[PDB]
Design a protein around this motif. Structure first.
Motif, short mmCIF file in Angstrom:
data_model
loop_
_atom_site.label_atom_id
_atom_site.label_comp_id
_atom_site.label_asym_id
_atom_site.label_seq_id
_atom_site.Cartn_x
_atom_site.Cartn_y
_atom_site.Cartn_z
N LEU A 163 0.64 -0.72 -0.48
CA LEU A 163 -0.15 -0.01 0.44
C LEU A 163 1.16 0.83 -0.67
N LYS A 164 2.03 1.23 0.80
CA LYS A 164 2.92 2.53 0.89
C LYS A 164 3.83 2.74 -0.51
N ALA A 165 3.65 1.51 -1.33
CA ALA A 165 4.38 1.32 -2.54
C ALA A 165 3.57 2.13 -3.52
N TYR A 166 2.13 1.95 -3.85
CA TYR A 166 0.64 2.20 -4.08
C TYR A 166 0.96 3.83 -3.98
N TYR A 167 0.80 3.80 -2.75
CA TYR A 167 0.59 5.74 -2.28
C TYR A 167 1.95 6.53 -2.82
N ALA A 168 3.12 6.23 -3.05
CA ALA A 168 4.45 6.25 -3.82
C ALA A 168 3.96 7.23 -4.60
N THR A 169 3.69 6.23 -5.32
CA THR A 169 3.73 6.48 -6.80
C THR A 169 1.99 6.77 -7.41
N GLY A 170 2.10 6.80 -6.08
CA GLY A 170 -0.02 7.87 -6.77
C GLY A 170 0.02 9.12 -7.15
N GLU A 171 1.13 9.81 -6.96
CA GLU A 171 1.26 11.41 -8.02
C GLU A 171 1.81 11.27 -9.00
N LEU A 172 2.86 10.19 -9.11
CA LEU A 172 3.20 10.20 -10.82
C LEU A 172 2.46 9.67 -11.14
N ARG A 173 1.55 8.66 -10.96
CA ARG A 173 0.41 8.40 -11.94
C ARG A 173 -0.46 8.97 -12.55
N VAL A 174 -0.99 10.53 -11.23
CA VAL A 174 -1.86 11.28 -11.61
C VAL A 174 -1.64 12.51 -12.05
N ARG A 175 -0.46 12.94 -11.90
CA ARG A 175 0.52 13.58 -12.72
C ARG A 175 0.78 13.93 -14.72
N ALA A 176 1.26 11.57 -14.77
CA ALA A 176 0.65 10.92 -16.17
C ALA A 176 -0.18 11.14 -16.56
N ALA A 177 -1.41 10.59 -16.16
CA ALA A 177 -3.03 11.29 -16.82
C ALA A 177 -3.85 11.63 -16.85
N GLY A 178 -2.87 13.17 -15.63
CA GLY A 178 -3.11 14.49 -16.01
C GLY A 178 -2.86 14.60 -18.08
N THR A 179 -1.42 14.78 -17.75
CA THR A 179 -1.25 15.08 -18.63
C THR A 179 -1.48 14.12 -20.44
N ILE A 180 -1.78 13.30 -20.15
CA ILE A 180 -2.22 12.31 -21.34
C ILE A 180 -3.78 12.81 -21.39
N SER A 181 -4.79 13.46 -20.52
CA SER A 181 -5.68 13.58 -20.93
C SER A 181 -6.01 15.21 -21.24
N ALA A 182 -4.25 15.80 -21.31
CA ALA A 182 -4.45 17.11 -21.79
C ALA A 182 -4.11 16.55 -23.11
N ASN A 183 -3.19 15.79 -22.76
CA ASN A 183 -2.85 15.98 -24.87
C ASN A 183 -3.21 14.60 -26.06
N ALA A 184 -4.58 13.90 -25.37
CA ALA A 184 -5.04 12.45 -25.87
C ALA A 184 -5.53 12.94 -27.48
N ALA A 185 -5.67 13.63 -28.16
CA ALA A 185 -6.43 13.63 -29.47
C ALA A 185 -5.09 13.90 -30.26
N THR A 186 -3.60 15.25 -29.91
CA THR A 186 -2.82 14.91 -29.91
C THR A 186 -1.89 13.12 -30.21
#
Ligand SMILES: CCC1=C(C)/C(=C/C2=NC(=C\c3[nH]c(/C=C4\NC(=O)[C@H](C)[C@H]4CC)c(C)c3CCC(=O)O)/C(CCC(=O)O)=C2C)NC1=O
Ligand SMILES: CCC1=C(C)/C(=C/C2=NC(=C\c3[nH]c(/C=C4\NC(=O)[C@H](C)[C@H]4CC)c(C)c3CCC(=O)O)/C(CCC(=O)O)=C2C)NC1=O
Ligand SMILES: CCC1=C(C)/C(=C/C2=NC(=C\c3[nH]c(/C=C4\NC(=O)[C@H](C)[C@H]4CC)c(C)c3CCC(=O)O)/C(CCC(=O)O)=C2C)NC1=O
Ligand SMILES: CCC1=C(C)/C(=C/C2=NC(=C\c3[nH]c(/C=C4\NC(=O)[C@H](C)[C@H]4CC)c(C)c3CCC(=O)O)/C(CCC(=O)O)=C2C)NC1=O
Ligand SMILES: CCC1=C(C)/C(=C/C2=NC(=C\c3[nH]c(/C=C4\NC(=O)[C@H](C)[C@H]4CC)c(C)c3CCC(=O)O)/C(CCC(=O)O)=C2C)NC1=O
Ligand SMILES: CCC1=C(C)/C(=C/C2=NC(=C\c3[nH]c(/C=C4\NC(=O)[C@H](C)[C@H]4CC)c(C)c3CCC(=O)O)/C(CCC(=O)O)=C2C)NC1=O
Ligand SMILES: CCC1=C(C)/C(=C/C2=NC(=C\c3[nH]c(/C=C4\NC(=O)[C@H](C)[C@H]4CC)c(C)c3CCC(=O)O)/C(CCC(=O)O)=C2C)NC1=O
Ligand SMILES: CCC1=C(C)/C(=C/C2=NC(=C\c3[nH]c(/C=C4\NC(=O)[C@H](C)[C@H]4CC)c(C)c3CCC(=O)O)/C(CCC(=O)O)=C2C)NC1=O
Ligand SMILES: CCC1=C(C)/C(=C/C2=NC(=C\c3[nH]c(/C=C4\NC(=O)[C@H](C)[C@H]4CC)c(C)c3CCC(=O)O)/C(CCC(=O)O)=C2C)NC1=O
Ligand SMILES: CCC1=C(C)/C(=C/C2=NC(=C\c3[nH]c(/C=C4\NC(=O)[C@H](C)[C@H]4CC)c(C)c3CCC(=O)O)/C(CCC(=O)O)=C2C)NC1=O
Lengths: 49, 66, 162, 49, 160, 160, 162, 160, 162, 162, 160, 162
Positions: free
Chosen positions: G27-50
Motif C-alpha cells: 500500500l505504501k508503494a502504491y501511495y508513493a507512486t500515486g502522485e506520478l500516476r496522477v500527473r501522467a494521467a493529467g498529461t495524457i488527458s490534456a494531450n490525448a487527441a494529439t
C-alpha cells in the motif's frame, strides 16, 4: 454470469467471395452476346467507306 | 429545467388491437429535459397530438444547474 | 440543482460579469460553514433511522387517530408510506443543508407534492407536524448551529406543504 | 430507463464486460433480442466510445 | 460544484453521502480560500491575459488574421478576444466551483456545433486556449498554476 | 477505492478523469500515510477493541447472553465476537481503501438476508457496531476518530 | 475492475487476515507512486487527441498500405473505426495506469478482441504496431518516470492481442 | 445502387417489390447507358478536372496553401489533390450506381472523424468539391451536367 | 402527414364522392409543379448549412441581445439548440414544399412546439424573425417560383408560432 | 448488401481504380439483363402464393411424415412457420435475382440458418427438397431463361443449407 | 403516396432526401399523367363496372341473394352494390396515389372484424372483387390492365 | 376493483369492526344473488358476438350517418374500433354484474374516457345510445330478473359517459 464470452463478436463481411464470378451466368452470357449486336449496329451506322 | 410534464393523445391508425389501449393513448407523463426532443419527435412520428407541456421541476432561463 | 456556489455563478453568468467582491464574500461565507454542514450531515446520516423512529412515534402519539382505523396511516401499507415520506423529507432536507440552498427541495420534493397529497387525501397539516417532529428531534441531536441550519430547510418544507 | 441507467446496472453489465458484450447484453435486457446486424453494432459501439 | 456532484450521486441511489463523498466535500471546503484567491488573481488580470493570449494566438496561427481567415478584420478580432474573455470567466467559475461543470454547461456543451455554424476553426480555438493557459499560469505560482492549467487543459481537450 | 470509483465514473462517460477527479485522487494518495497508521492502530489493538465492545454490547443488551438469546452460550458468544472481529477488519480495509466499498461488498450486500437466516437480530448488530465505534474512536486522535467514526456510522446505517 | 489497493484487500480477505507489514508495504508503494500516476494521467488527458494523431500518422507512415485502397483502414468509415479503436486503447491504458492494475484491460478491452478482429478481418499485427506507436508517443509525452509505468499496460494490451 | 435501395426498402417491410419500385428499377436500367457515358466522360478527363479544381481551390482559399495551412507544402498539396481524385472517383461510382450509396459508404461515413484526426478543414473540403462541381459540369451537356451536379451537391452537403 | 394527392383523396373520401374534374385539375396542377419542387428541394439540401448560417447571422445581427449574456441564445448549449431548431424548421419546410401541403408542419413541427417554447421561455417574435431570415436566404437561393413556394410554408411556420 | 453494380464498384474500389473498359462491359451486361430481371420479379411477386401452395404440396406429398402427428410440420404453428420459411426463401431468391448477386443470400438468409434449424429440429434435407420443389414451380412460371437464372439463386440456397 | 413514403423515410433518418429519392419522386410525377388518365377512365365507367360485377357475383354465388343469404332482399343487395362502389372508389384513389396506401387506410384495416360483425362472407368479398377486377381490366387497354389489376389483387388478398 | 364482499370488508375495516349481524346479512344477500349472476354471465359469454351484432345494427339503423362518409364510424378501422368499444362495454358490464359492484367500470372503463373520446372526436351521445341499444338487446337474452341487474351497470356506464 454463466459465461463472459461475447456471443456476437461481429458479423463476418460478405462483400466479396472467392470465385463464382457469375460472369459465366447464362443470361449474363446472353447479355454479352447482345452487346456485341449493339456494337455491330453502331459500327454499321458509320459511313461505308 | 430538467422536467417537462407532457399530456399527449396518441391515436391508432396501423391496426385495431385486442388490447384496451386506453392506457397508452391519452396520458400524462414526466420526461426529463434532454429526453424531451426525442420524446416529442417520437410522439409526432406516431401520429399523436401533444395536448400540453409544462414546466414542473426547474426554472426556465437558468444557466447553471441544468 | 443549485448549491450556493452554483447560485452565485448563475447570477454572475446571466449578468455576464466576472466575480465581484460581494461574490467572493458569499463564497467565503459558504466555504466557512462547509465543515459545520459536513458534520451535521454525517450526524444526521448516522442517526437517520433513529430520527425517523422518534419523529413518527411523536407524530402518532400527538395524533393517535392517524394510525387507528379510519386514519390515513392505518394499514401496514399506508403506515409504511408515511414513514417512507418522512425518510424522504429527512434525506432531502439534509441534501439542501449540505448544498446550502433550497433549490433541491422544490426541484425534487415540493413540485406537485401538495396536489398529490390532496388527491390522495393525505392531511397536509399532519405532514407538517411530522416535519416539525423531525425538526425537533434532529435539532436536539445535531447541536445549536446545525439545529438552526437544518431548521431553515425543515421550515422550507413545512411552508411548501402548507 | 431509470433501472437500466442506474449505477447498479452499470456495475452488473457495463463495467465487467467489453463494449461489444455491453451492446449484446443491453439489447437482450431492453429489446428482447441479441445484436441484430453489423450496422447496429457500429452504432452502439460509436455511442459507447 | 463538488457538492452538487456528490449530492446527485447520493440521490441516484437514494442514500446519504458516503464517508468518501463527505471527505471530498471537506477537502473542497478546506481548499476554498486558496482557489478563491486564485480566482481573484485571474479576475484582476483579465484584460492583460486576454491581450497577451490574443497576441500569442495570432503569432502562432496567422491564417486567422490572414485573408480568408475567420478572424480577418477588426470587428472579427474584437469578437475573437471577446470569446477568450468568456472562456477566462468560465475558467474562474470552474476554479471556484471545484469542478468543470460550469464550464461544461455554459461554454462546452454544444460548442462544436456553435463554432461549426460560425466557421470558427477548433484547432485555432485550441491554440487560443493554450495561449491563455500559458499567459494565466505565467501570473500564478506553481501550486496555483497546476490547478489552473488543469482547467485550461480540460477546456482545450473539450474544444477539440 | 477512491481511484476505482473515479475511474469507473469517468469510464461511464467515455472520458478521461476531470480536474476534480484527479484532485480527489491526489488528495487521497497524499493522505495515504495517516490512513495506514490508523489501520496500524486498529489492527495492533483489535483484541482489546473486540473484548471491550463485547462487554459494552452484553451490558446494554443482557437478553442476547441470557438463555433464549441469540448469543447465549460459549460458542454463540464466540461467534458474536467473531462477527465483531470481521467488521473491525472490514473497517480497516475501508480506511485503507479510502471508501466504504470493501466494507460494502464483503459485509453489507446481503447482510440482512444472512442475519435473518441466522436469526441474528439487526438492532443487536447496530448496538454492537456502536459499541465498537466508541471503543475504537477512544483509541484514536480526534481527526482520525471522526474519519473512522464515519465508517462505523456507515456500517451501522447499513445494518439498521 | 480492481486496483492495487483493492487487490491487496481481496488477497488478505480471502485469507481472512488483518493487514500484515507486507500489505502495508504494498500500500505504501502504491501511495508513493500515486502522485506520478496522477500527473501522467493529467498529461495524457490534456494531450490525448494529439497522441492519437501522431500515433496514427506514424502507423500509417510505417504501413502506408493500411490507408491506401485495399488496406483495412481504407475508407472514411474504417479509418474512423481505426482511430476509435486507438482511442479505446489509450483511454483504457490510462485507466489501468492510474489504477496500478491490468484487470480493467481484461474486462473492458481484451475480452473477445481477437474474435471481433478475426471476424472483421482486422489485422492483429498492425493493431499491435499501432499500440506500440501509441506507446512511444505517450512515453515521450509523459516523461522518464511515467513512460516505464505506462509501457507495462501498453505491452499488456499488445500481449493480450498477440 | 438503385436496385439495392429498392430491395432494402422492400425487405424492411418484408414484402416483394411493388410495380412502382420495379418501374423505378426499369427506368434506372434504361438510363444506365447514359450514366455509363457520363462516367466515361468524367473518367477520361480526371487529370484535367483535378488540376483545375485544385487551382480554383487555391485561388479561392489561399490560406490552405499559405503557412499554417493544412495543404502547405508540395507533399501536403499532393495529398490534397489525391483526396480530390478519391472523391472524383466516388462521384463516377455514384453516377453508374444511380445513387450516392457508394459515395456515402466509401467517402462520407466517418469523414468528420478522419479529417479531424487529420486536422483538415471541412470548409476547405466543401470549397474543393464545389470547384470540382464547376469544372466537371463545364465538361458536360446541360442534362448530364445537372445529374452530375446533384452528386457533387450531395458530397458538399455531406462534408458541410 | 398528407401530401397534395393524399389531401385531395381524403377530401373526396370524406364526402364519399368519386374524383370530379376539379380533383383531376388539382392533381395535374401538383404533378406539373413537382419537378420545380424537386430542384428546389435538392438545392436546399445542398445548401442547408449555408442557409442556416446566413439566417442565424442575420437573426443575431438584427437582435444582438439574444446571444449576449442574459439572452435566450446565450450559451454554447442554448445557441446550439437555437440553430438546431432553425435546421429542423428549414428541413421540414423543404418536406412540406415537396409534399405540396402544410400538414406535415402540423403533425411534426407545430404539434406541441408552441407550448414547449412557451414553457421554455423562448421568445416567439425572435423565432419568427429567424424563420423570416431563413425565408429570405432560401428564396434568394432557389429563385422566384421556388421562393414563393417555400415562403408559403415559411409563413405557415411563422403564423403557427404567432 | 451487394448487387452487380456494387460488386463492380467494390472490385474497382479495392484497387483504387477508375472504371476501365471491362468494368463498363460488365455494367452494360447487367443493364441489359435488367429488363428480364424485372419481368421475372413481377411474375414471381404476382404468383408467390401459388408457388408456395404448389411447392409445399409436393414437399408434403413426398414426405407425408412431416405433417402426420409428431412431424416437424405437424401443428398449425409449425405448418404456418414452414410455409412462412418457404415464402422467405422465395422472397430472398427474388431479391437476389433482381440484384444479380448472391451476397444477400449469405447475409440475410444463410447466416446461422443451419444451426437455427439444428437447434429446432427442423429437417434440413426436407427444407432443401422444398426449395427444389419451389424452383421447379417457379421455372414453369417465369420462362426458360428466367428459369435458369432463378435456379442459380435457389441452388445457392440449397447448397448453403446442405 | 410515394412522396409521403419518401418524406417519412428521410425523416426517420433525420436527413434531407437523397438524389435517388428525388429521382424516384421525379419518375412518380412523370407517371402521374397516365395515372390520372387511368383513374378517369375507371371513374367514367362507374355504373357499368358495378352492374356487371354484381351480376357475375350473383350468378357465381346465388346463395348470397338466395333465402338465408347475407344479401337477400332489395336493401341488402343494394348494400352489397354500395360496398362494391366503395371499393371501386378506393381503387381509383389507389391509382392516383400510386400505391395501395389509401385502400389500406380506408377499407383494409379492420375489414375482417367489420364483416364478421356484419356476417358478410369474406369469400363472397373476394369473388366480388375478382369480378370487379375482370370488368375494370376489360374496359381498359392492355397497358392499364396490369396496374389496375395490381390494386384489385392487393384488395382481394387483404380480404382473403 | 372491489366486489360486494370486498366492499363490505372495506367498510368494516375503515371502522375497525369485526362482522356483526348486518354485515353477515349483506353477505347472505350477495350469495343469494350469486347463482343468478353466474347464470347471466355464462349466458352473455355464450352470446357476446350476437349481442354485439344486434346492438351495432340498432345503433347504425337509428343513426345511419355515423357509418356513411363523414361519420366517425366511417372506415373499416373506425367501424372496427366502434364495435370493439361496444364489446368492451359489454364485457366490463358482465364483469361488474358478476362482481355486484360498479367500481370496475370507473377504475377501468371510465377513467379517462371523456378526454380520449373528446380529443379523438368520438360523439358521446351516439355512444350512450349504443349503450342503451346493447342493454335492450342483452335484457332479452339474460331473463327478466337478470335484465334489470345488468341494466343497472349499463346505466352506470351511460351516465359515466353522459
Ligand atoms: C377497456 C376500456 C377502454 C375503452 C372502451 C376504450 C375506447 C377507445 N376508443 C378509441 C378510438 C375509437 N372509438 C370509436 C367508437 C365511436 N365511434 C362511433 O362514433 C361510435 C358511436 C362510437 C362507438 C360506439 C372510434 C370510431 C374510434 C376511432 C377514432 C380514431 O379514428 O382515432 C380509442 C383510441 C385508440 C384505438 O382506436 O384503439 C380508445 C382508447 N379505451 C379503453 O382503455
Ligand atoms: C391492520 C394493519 C395494522 C397493524 C398490524 C398495525 C400495527 C401497529 N403497531 C404499532 C405499535 C406496537 N405494536 C406492538 C406489537 C409487538 N409487540 C411484541 O413485540 C409482538 C412480537 C408484537 C405483537 C404480537 C407493540 C408492543 C407496539 C407498541 C410499541 C411502541 O409504541 O413503542 C403501531 C404504531 C402505533 C400504534 O398503533 O400503537 C402500529 C401502526 N397497524 C396497522 O394499521
Ligand atoms: C421524493 C419526494 C416524494 C414524496 C414526498 C412523495 C410523497 C407520496 N406519498 C404517497 C403515498 C402516502 N403518503 C402517506 C403519508 C401521509 N399520510 C399520513 O397520514 C402522514 C400524515 C403523512 C406522512 C407524514 C400515506 C399514508 C400514503 C398512502 C396513500 C394511499 O395509499 O392512500 C405518494 C403516492 C405514491 C405511492 O404511495 O407509492 C406519494 C407520491 N413522493 C415522492 O417521490
Ligand atoms: C465478513 C462478512 C461475514 C459476516 C459478518 C458473517 C457473519 C456470520 N455469523 C454467523 C453465526 C453467528 N453470529 C452471531 C452474532 C450475533 N449474535 C448476537 O446477537 C449479535 C447481535 C450478533 C454479533 C454482534 C451468532 C450468535 C452466531 C451463531 C448463530 C447460530 O449458530 O445459530 C455465521 C454462520 C457461521 C458460524 O456460526 O460461524 C456467519 C456466516 N459471515 C461473513 O462471511
Ligand atoms: C476514399 C475515402 C478516403 C479519403 C477521402 C481519404 C483521405 C486521406 N487524406 C489523408 C492526408 C491528407 N489529406 C489532405 C487534403 C486536405 N488538405 C486541404 O486542406 C484540403 C481542404 C483538403 C483536400 C481538398 C492533406 C493535406 C493531407 C495530408 C495531412 C498530413 O500529412 O498531416 C489521409 C491520411 C493518410 C494518407 O495520406 O494516405 C487520408 C486517409 N482516405 C480515404 O480512405
Ligand atoms: C475497448 C474494447 C473494444 C475494442 C477495442 C473494440 C474494437 C472494434 N473495432 C471494430 C471495427 C474496426 N476496427 C478497425 C481498426 C483496425 N483496422 C486498421 O487496419 C488498424 C490496423 C486497426 C486499428 C489500429 C477497423 C478498420 C474497423 C472496421 C472493420 C470493418 O467494419 O470492416 C469494431 C466493430 C464496430 C465498428 O466498426 O465500429 C469494434 C467493436 N471493441 C471493443 O469492445
Ligand atoms: C459563454 C459561452 C459563449 C461563447 C464562447 C460564445 C462565442 C460566440 N462567438 C461568436 C462570433 C465570433 N467568434 C469569433 C472567434 C474566432 N475567431 C477566430 O477564428 C478564433 C479561432 C476564434 C477566437 C479565438 C469570431 C471571428 C466571431 C465572428 C464570426 C462571424 O461574424 O461570422 C458568436 C456569435 C454572435 C457574436 O458575434 O457574439 C458567439 C455566440 N457565445 C457564448 O454564449
Ligand atoms: C421537430 C420540431 C421541434 C422543434 C423545433 C423543437 C424545439 C425545442 N427547443 C428546445 C430548447 C431551445 N430552443 C431554443 C431556440 C430559441 N432560442 C433563440 O432565442 C431562438 C429565437 C430560438 C430558435 C430560433 C433554445 C435557446 C432552447 C434552450 C432553452 C433552455 O434550455 O432554456 C427544446 C427543449 C428540449 C431539448 O432542447 O432537448 C425543444 C423540444 N422540438 C421539436 O420536436
Ligand atoms: C393438429 C392440427 C392440424 C390440422 C387441423 C391440420 C390440417 C391439414 N389438412 C390438410 C389437407 C386437407 N384438409 C382438408 C379439409 C377441408 N376440406 C373441406 O373443404 C373442409 C372445409 C375442410 C375440413 C372440414 C382437405 C380436403 C385436405 C386435402 C387437400 C388436398 O388434397 O389438396 C393438410 C395437408 C397435409 C395432409 O393432408 O396430410 C393439413 C396439414 N394439420 C395439423 O397439424
Ligand atoms: C369505405 C369502406 C367501408 C366499407 C367497405 C364498409 C362496408 C359496410 N357494409 C355494410 C352493410 C352490408 N354489406 C353487405 C355486402 C355483402 N353482402 C354479401 O354477402 C356480399 C358477399 C357482400 C357484398 C359484395 C351487406 C348484405 C350488408 C347489410 C348487412 C345487414 O344488414 O345485415 C355496413 C353497415 C352500415 C351500412 O349498411 O350502411 C358497412 C359499414 N363500410 C365502410 O366505411
Amino acid at each position: 454470469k454463466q459465461s463472459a464470452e461475447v456471443v456476437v463478436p461481429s458479423f463476418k463481411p460478405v462483400t466479396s467471395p472467392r470465385g463464382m464470378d457469375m460472369s459465366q451466368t447464362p443470361l449474363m452470357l446472353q447479355a454479352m452476346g447482345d452487346i456485341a449486336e449493339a456494337e455491330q449496329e453502331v459500327a454499321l451506322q458509320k459511313p461505308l467507306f | 429545467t430538467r422536467l417537462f410534464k407532457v399530456t399527449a393523445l396518441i391515436p391508432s391508425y396501423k391496426k385495431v388491437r385486442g388490447g384496451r389501449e386506453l392506457q397508452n393513448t391519452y396520458f400524462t407523463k414526466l420526461v426529463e429535459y434532454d429526453r424531451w426532443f426525442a420524446e416529442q419527435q417520437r410522439i409526432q412520428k406516431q401520429g399523436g397530438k401533444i395536448l400540453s407541456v409544462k414546466m414542473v421541476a426547474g426554472k426556465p432561463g437558468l444557466n447553471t444547474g441544468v | 440543482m443549485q448549491d450556493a456556489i452554483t447560485s452565485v455563478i448563475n447570477t454572475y453568468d446571466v449578468q455576464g460579469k466576472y466575480f465581484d467582491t460581494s461574490a467572493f464574500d458569499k463564497l467565503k461565507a459558504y466555504y466557512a460553514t462547509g465543515e459545520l454542514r459536513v458534520r451535521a450531515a454525517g450526524t444526521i446520516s448516522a442517526n437517520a433511522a433513529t430520527i425517523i423512529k422518534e419523529a413518527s412515534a411523536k407524530l402518532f402519539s400527538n395524533q393517535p387517530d392517524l394510525v387507528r382505523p379510519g386514519g390515513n396511516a392505518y394499514t401496514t401499507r399506508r403506515y409504511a408510506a408515511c414513514v417512507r415520506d418522512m425518510d424522504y423529507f429527512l434525506r432531502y432536507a439534509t441534501y439542501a443543508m449540505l448544498a446550502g440552498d433550497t433549490s433541491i427541495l422544490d426541484e425534487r420534493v415540493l413540485n406537485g407534492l401538495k396536489e398529490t397529497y390532496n388527491s390522495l387525501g393525505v392531511p397536509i397539516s399532519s405532514t407538517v407536524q411530522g416535519i416539525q417532529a423531525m425538526k425537533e428531534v434532529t435539532g436536539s441531536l445535531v447541536g445549536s448551529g446545525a439545529a438552526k441550519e437544518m431548521g431553515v430547510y425543515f421550515d422550507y418544507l413545512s411552508s411548501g406543504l402548507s | 430507463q431509470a433501472l437500466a441507467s442506474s449505477d447498479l446496472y452499470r456495475k452488473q453489465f457495463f463495467e465487467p464486460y467489453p463494449p461489444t458484450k455491453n451492446v449484446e447484453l443491453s439489447l437482450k435486457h431492453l429489446l428482447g433480442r441479441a445484436t441484430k446486424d453489423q450496422a447496429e453494432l457500429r452504432k452502439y459501439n460509436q455511442i459507447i466510445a | 460544484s463538488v457538492v452538487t456532484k456528490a449530492i446527485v450521486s447520493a440521490d441516484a441511489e437514494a442514500r446519504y453521502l458516503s464517508p468518501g463523498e463527505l471527505d471530498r466535500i471537506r477537502g473542497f471546503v478546506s481548499s476554498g480560500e486558496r482557489r478563491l484567491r486564485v480566482a481573484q488573481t485571474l479576475t484582476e488580470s483579465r484584460e492583460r491575459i486576454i491581450k497577451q493570449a490574443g497576441d500569442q494566438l495570432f503569432q502562432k496561427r496567422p491564417d486567422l488574421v490572414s485573408p480568408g481567415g475567420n478572424a480577418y478584420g477588426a470587428e472579427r478580432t474584437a469578437s475573437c478576444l471577446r470569446d477568450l474573455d468568456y472562456y477566462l470567466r468560465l475558467v474562474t467559475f470552474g476554479i471556484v466551483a471545484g469542478d468543470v461543470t460550469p464550464i461544461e454547461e455554459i461554454g462546452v456543451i454544444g460548442v462544436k456545433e456553435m463554432y461549426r455554424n460560425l466557421e470558427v476553426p477548433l484547432p485555432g480555438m485550441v491554440e487560443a486556449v493554450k495561449a491563455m493557459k500559458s499567459v494565466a499560469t505565467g501570473l500564478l505560482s506553481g501550486d496555483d498554476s497546476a490547478e489552473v492549467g488543469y482547467y485550461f487543459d480540460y477546456l482545450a481537450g473539450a474544444l477539440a
